[PDB]
Amino acid sequence: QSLQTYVTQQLIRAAEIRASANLAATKMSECVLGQSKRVDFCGKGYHLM
Amino acid sequence: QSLQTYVTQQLIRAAEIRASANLAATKMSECVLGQSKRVDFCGKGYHLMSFPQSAPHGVVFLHVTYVPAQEKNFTTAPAICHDGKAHFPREGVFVSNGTHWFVTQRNFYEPQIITTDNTFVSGNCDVVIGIVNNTVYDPLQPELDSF
Amino acid sequence: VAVLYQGVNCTEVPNVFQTRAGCLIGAEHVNNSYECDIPIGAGICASYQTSQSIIAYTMSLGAENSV
Amino acid sequence: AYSNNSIAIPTNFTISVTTEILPVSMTKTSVDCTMYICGDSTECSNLLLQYGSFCTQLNRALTGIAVEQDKNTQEVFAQVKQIYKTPPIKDFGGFNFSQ
Amino acid sequence: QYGSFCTQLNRALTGIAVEQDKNTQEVFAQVKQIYKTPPIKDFGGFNFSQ
Amino acid sequence: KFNGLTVLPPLLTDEMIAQYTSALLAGTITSGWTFGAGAALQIPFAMQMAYRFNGIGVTQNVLYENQKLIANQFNSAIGKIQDSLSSTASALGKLQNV
Amino acid sequence: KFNGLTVLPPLLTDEMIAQYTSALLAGTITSGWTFGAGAALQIPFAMQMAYRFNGIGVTQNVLYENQKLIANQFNSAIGKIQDSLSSTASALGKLQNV
Numbered sequence: 001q002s003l004q005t006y007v008t009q010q011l012i013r014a015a016e017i018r019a020s021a022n023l024a025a026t027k028m029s030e031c032v033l034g035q036s037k038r039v040d041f042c043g044k045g046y047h048l049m
Numbered sequence: 050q051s052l053q054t055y056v057t058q059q060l061i062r063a064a065e066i067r068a069s070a071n072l073a074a075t076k077m078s079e080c081v082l083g084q085s086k087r088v089d090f091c092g093k094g095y096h097l098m099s100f101p102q103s104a105p106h107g108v109v110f111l112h113v114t115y116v117p118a119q120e121k122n123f124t125t126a127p128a129i130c131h132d133g134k135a136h137f138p139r140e141g142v143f144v145s146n147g148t149h150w151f152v153t154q155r156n157f158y159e160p161q162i163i164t165t166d167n168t169f170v171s172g173n174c175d176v177v178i179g180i181v182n183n184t185v186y187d188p189l190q191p192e193l194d195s196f
Numbered sequence: 197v198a199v200l201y202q203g204v205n206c207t208e209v210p211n212v213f214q215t216r217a218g219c220l221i222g223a224e225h226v227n228n229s230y231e232c233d234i235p236i237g238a239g240i241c242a243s244y245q246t247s248q249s250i251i252a253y254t255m256s257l258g259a260e261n262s263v
Numbered sequence: 264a265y266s267n268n269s270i271a272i273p274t275n276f277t278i279s280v281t282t283e284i285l286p287v288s289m290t291k292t293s294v295d296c297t298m299y300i301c302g303d304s305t306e307c308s309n310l311l312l313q314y315g316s317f318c319t320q321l322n323r324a325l326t327g328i329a330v331e332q333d334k335n336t337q338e339v340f341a342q343v344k345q346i347y348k349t350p351p352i353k354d355f356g357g358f359n360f361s362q
Numbered sequence: 363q364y365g366s367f368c369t370q371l372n373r374a375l376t377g378i379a380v381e382q383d384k385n386t387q388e389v390f391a392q393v394k395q396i397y398k399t400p401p402i403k404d405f406g407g408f409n410f411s412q
Numbered sequence: 413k414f415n416g417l418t419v420l421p422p423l424l425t426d427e428m429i430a431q432y433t434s435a436l437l438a439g440t441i442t443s444g445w446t447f448g449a450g451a452a453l454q455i456p457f458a459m460q461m462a463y464r465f466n467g468i469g470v471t472q473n474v475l476y477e478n479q480k481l482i483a484n485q486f487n488s489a490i491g492k493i494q495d496s497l498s499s500t501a502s503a504l505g506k507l508q509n510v
Numbered sequence: 511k512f513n514g515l516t517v518l519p520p521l522l523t524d525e526m527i528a529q530y531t532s533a534l535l536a537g538t539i540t541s542g543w544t545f546g547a548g549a550a551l552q553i554p555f556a557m558q559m560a561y562r563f564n565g566i567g568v569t570q571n572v573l574y575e576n577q578k579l580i581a582n583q584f585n586s587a588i589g590k591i592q593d594s595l596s597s598t599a600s601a602l603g604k605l606q607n608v
């Protein structure tokens with residue numbers, strides 16, 4: 001029982017952190033290799049780099 | 050116990066694939082019915098269009114991407130001073146092959162002669178750096194003198 | 197109401213209409229096309245309409261036009 | 264090769280085609296308790312009745328999953344109000360599309 | 363006597379580990395080749411020595 | 413299937429999905445992108461190519477003056493994409509994994 | 511580690527990660543973003559700043575005529591960020607929670 005509970009918790013946290021990984025990838029591809037016009041995405045205001 | 054474990058696994062996997070479904074929906078709405086300027090979203094490079102295709106339990110796209118090719122390098126200058134005042138390119142980059150100056154667009158080599166049609170002035174040439182000496186052709190004097 | 201027996205032939209169940217998802221009783225198959233109300237499956241779904249009865253039919257993919 | 268006065272510009276371009284494959288839906292499945300846990304016997308159903316309400320939860324979860332999959336496969340594709348059709352004649356300025 | 367549980371557990375943990383490796387590979391390695399800065403630094407007065 | 417497991421067929425069959433994909437392709441190829449906002453309009457494909465080049469920082473003179481040549485690459489592009497899926501089976505990995 | 515638990519080292523070590531980050535920074539600083547689409551081109555920093563200003567609705571004359579000043583602030587901002595992390599420890603919270 002204890003081992004199954006631990007495995008389930010780890011599964012949920014990994015599934016959560018996958019979203020942060022994807023968000024970081026999108027920010028790296030947009031804010032860095034170009035300029036993004038999405039307001040309040042890359043910096044608070046008008047973005048430069 | 051076994052049945053509960055199976056149900057939990059199925060729940061987690063379905064909740065994961067929901068995200069892929071949402072991502073595919075967003076790509077279908079953006080890449081297909083228009084042009085998206087987000088870098089590395091619809092193809093690797095400058096995006097042109099997409100074509101969707103079905104597949105068993107999935108979707109396959111066809112991103113058509115524009116990619117540059119062999120290039121040549123030259124000497125540049127951020128501005129040109131003609132009559133004491135500065136002269137900046139309206140939309141483009143100043144370039145020169147070492148003898149005659151030209152203005153071109155930023156993604157395809159296309160020299161053009163310097164003219165007041167595609168240039169605007171801002172102050173005199175004493176604060177900007179990298180300023181160079183040249184002349185700006187006027188397209189209205191020739192038909193002034195044609196009379 | 198109408199009753200659907202899933203994945204079993206109506207040759208040994210006890211106005212029937214055999215379908216892909218199974219076979220159902222209590223409804224009649226029309227040839228027309230309408231927007232789906234109560235989805236059954238395999239492109240076949242039913243609704244309540246005019247006296248009044250439950251009718252099942254093939255789904256309609258919206259209107260059609262050329263350019 | 265970087266310097267304070269040197270600009271590189273391309274003189275040609277190539278059009279490329281890139282593919283990417285995305286999953287959409289799983290396979291809608293379902294499992295019934297009494298046929299699975301019990302051997303279609305009252306001697307097992309009576310004992311399972313003592314455990315309360317679990318199978319309602321299980322069936323509800325599986326039905327929710329199936330409905331979500333149907334909604335997903337409906338949402339990804341059906342984004343156009345009406346179905347169009349290509350003209351019988353093909354004249355696209357030399358572009359070939361019959362594949 | 364309990365059957366096949368540990369196969370499921372080990373499979374889940376291995377899947378998690380491979381997923382983490384894929385994540386850390388995907389976030390960073392988006393460049394085809396490694397570049398290098400020139401030895402001389404002339405960026406119009408801008409300072410990048412940190 | 414015997415013990416307790418059942419599978420339900422999908423609501424939309426493969427033919428309907430193919431019909432939607434064909435409709436989307438037909439809209440994109442002729443109507444341009446106006447049908448994504450409101451009613452579907454019509455416009456020649458070359459003009460749409462010009463209006464798509466106009467969105468990435470190049471003028472129309474790039475397309476028309478080379479128009480014929482451009483077509484070749486596109487055709488050749490598709491002429492490769494079949495082969496890229498004609499023999500290689502490692503491209504379709506995610507679906508097989510699922 | 512004794513009982514039954516083991517930890518596997520990551521595939522990419524720290525120095526390789528630093529090498530990728532350095533490569534990305536160098537590309538951004540000495541090529542603009544042409545390497546983000548295709549081959550890496552080269553262009554000085556001044557007109558890159560000029561175009562980045564041009565990308566938000568201000569003409570180039572804002573940059574050059576104040577270029578020197580634009581340098582100082584950008585240095586001083588960095589001169590602050592170190593003091594923003596040299597003593598404060600609450601900024602690096604999320605990673606700790608990981």
Ligand SMILES: *[C@@H]1O[C@H](CO)[C@@H](O[C@@H]2O[C@H](CO)[C@@H](O)[C@H](O)[C@H]2NC(C)=O)[C@H](O)[C@H]1NC(C)=O
Nearest residue numbers: 118119274275276277278480481482484485488
């Ligand atoms: C731009 O590149 C294309 C090909 O990438 C060049 O077209 C080639 O031209 C030669 C000479 O006419 C032909 O032998 C090739 O078959 C052409 N290739 C293709 C794919 O058609 C084109 O000449 C280049 N343009 C410039 C200005 O360099």
Ligand SMILES: *[C@@H]1O[C@H](CO)[C@@H](O[C@@H]2O[C@H](CO)[C@@H](O)[C@H](O)[C@H]2NC(C)=O)[C@H](O)[C@H]1NC(C)=O
Nearest residue numbers: 352353354355357358359360361362487490491
């Ligand atoms: C698109 O390209 C295909 C492939 O060449 C063309 O199909 C060929 O058409 C010719 C004459 O119509 C036949 O002799 C070939 O056997 C066809 N190839 C096949 C079937 O693989 C097709 O005609 C082209 N379409 C357009 C509009 O140009």
Ligand SMILES: *[C@@H]1O[C@H](CO)[C@@H](O[C@@H]2O[C@H](CO)[C@@H](O)[C@H](O)[C@H]2NC(C)=O)[C@H](O)[C@H]1NC(C)=O
Nearest residue numbers: 402403404405407408409410411412585588589
């Ligand atoms: C960027 O700023 C730093 C901080 O002032 C400069 O580093 C200083 O350089 C001077 C002259 O070489 C030394 O006397 C100082 O000791 C350095 N400071 C530190 C903390 O090491 C650096 O030179 C600047 N970068 C330039 C000018 O390109």
Ligand SMILES: *[C@@H]1O[C@H](CO)[C@@H](O)[C@H](O)[C@H]1NC(C)=O
Nearest residue numbers: 121122123124264266269271
């Ligand atoms: C142009 O680039 C090449 C390398 O791509 C370099 O060898 C050459 O010196 C450059 N030309 C100028 C004028 O800087």
Ligand SMILES: *[C@@H]1O[C@H](CO)[C@@H](O)[C@H](O)[C@H]1NC(C)=O
Nearest residue numbers: 145146147148149150151160
């Ligand atoms: C530079 O281009 C001009 C454009 O006509 C030409 O007259 C001149 O000869 C060229 N110079 C060199 C060195 O290629």
Ligand SMILES: *[C@@H]1O[C@H](CO)[C@@H](O)[C@H](O)[C@H]1NC(C)=O
Nearest residue numbers: 178179180266267268404406
């Ligand atoms: C570019 O750097 C060289 C190196 O000393 C210098 O002589 C030249 O004046 C610089 N150009 C500009 C425009 O600052």
Ligand SMILES: *[C@@H]1O[C@H](CO)[C@@H](O)[C@H](O)[C@H]1NC(C)=O
Nearest residue numbers: 130131133179180181182183
């Ligand atoms: C440009 O010309 C003016 C007037 O002819 C002169 O004062 C100035 O020194 C020149 N600058 C350069 C860089 O040749």
Ligand SMILES: *[C@@H]1O[C@H](CO)[C@@H](O)[C@H](O)[C@H]1NC(C)=O
Nearest residue numbers: 203204205206207208214218
């Ligand atoms: C149902 O029974 C009929 C009677 O002959 C048979 O033809 C048909 O194949 C059966 N269908 C199924 C799915 O068993």
Ligand SMILES: *[C@@H]1O[C@H](CO)[C@@H](O)[C@H](O)[C@H]1NC(C)=O
Nearest residue numbers: 212213224225226227228254
């Ligand atoms: C129309 O419906 C009737 C009533 O069941 C049926 O007999 C007939 O075959 C249908 N026609 C078509 C073309 O489906």
